[PDB]
Design a binder for this molecule. Sequence first.
Ligand code: U5B
Ligand code: NAG
Length: 353
Amino acid sequence: EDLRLHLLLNTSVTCNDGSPAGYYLKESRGSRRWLLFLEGGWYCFNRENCDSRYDTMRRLMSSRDWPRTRTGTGILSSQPEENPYWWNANMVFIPYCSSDVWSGASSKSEKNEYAFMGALIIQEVVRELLGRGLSGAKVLLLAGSSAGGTGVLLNVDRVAEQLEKLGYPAIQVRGLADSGWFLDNKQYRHTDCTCAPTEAIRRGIRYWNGVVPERCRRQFQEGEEWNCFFGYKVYPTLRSPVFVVQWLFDEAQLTVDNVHLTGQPVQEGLRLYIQNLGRELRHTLKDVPASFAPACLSHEIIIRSHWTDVQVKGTSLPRALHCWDRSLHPLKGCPVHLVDSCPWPHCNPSCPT
Ligand SMILES: O=C(O)CSc1ccc2c3c(cccc13)CC2
Ligand SMILES: *[C@@H]1O[C@H](CO)[C@@H](O)[C@H](O)[C@H]1NC(C)=O
């Protein structure tokens, strides 16, 4: 069940503080499927805010204290009972140590206190894995939760395209974006930059020299690339198949919207605010053919041990993913587009507690 740490042999690809980035691996000799999971954990968009993260979230900025191993849970579990979907796959956990929503290509230098290399970390992991069996893969699934889910959307097509330019057109690259499908909406109550979703990314993307998918960049153009960090804007531009998993009432979305459900009766204005949020999230998913979006107030799912438990219209997430697999070869009783229509958190009775 354990994934072993390997630090990058290319030590110019680093975490924020210059320590080498890396990946946790568990090989499955008899398997042609590879799961590369991108960890999440917010971001920092300037020197002072990143110094604060360095004090108290240092494992998200540095490999110096990483454990030698890591237990695979949820979709990274090797036990069929916990992971009906891909229990036999080669499992890869890429720790998030660049604080840049996996978008940066920026070395630490005399002009940069921190390195922001998330985009380069992903490609270096892919490069170093080819020699550990990935060259023989038929499917590479690039998955990720929260900031790592947004990182899937920013990076899936780039992974596909290095594999093509490296002479491996047989590997089918696909994406699995969990809890990284955000809305650039108005906060419920205004705060000073809990930064509003829109302005957080504009400052971040400049600070990291972050990079976005090419077609999306060509649409929005210079200075407007922050737009590509928002799933409903970047997804239509992607080629690789991408499965979108998204709570309709994501906790991180509510946080940046300054919504705090601290007990007490919810008043009319907040009720309508929350109900409109779920409706607009549904609307952005209507033309996403492979998606799983339950009406729950929660955050992340695919690496939780009880990710098998949630259902939309009677179908679980591991089942929906298997059905997605079959569709990538109109299936009878094996749906891939599963979006709740009920309008309030936990109107779905299988929501997590
Ligand atoms: O990693 C976590 O747990 C949370 S990331 C996150 C939160 C909130 C927002 C994000 C946006 C883009 C990319 C990532 C995020 C826009 C608004
Ligand atoms: C190491 O990574 C950097 C950043 O992507 C790249 O420019 C360089 O060519 C790599 N070096 C080797 C030896 O792979």
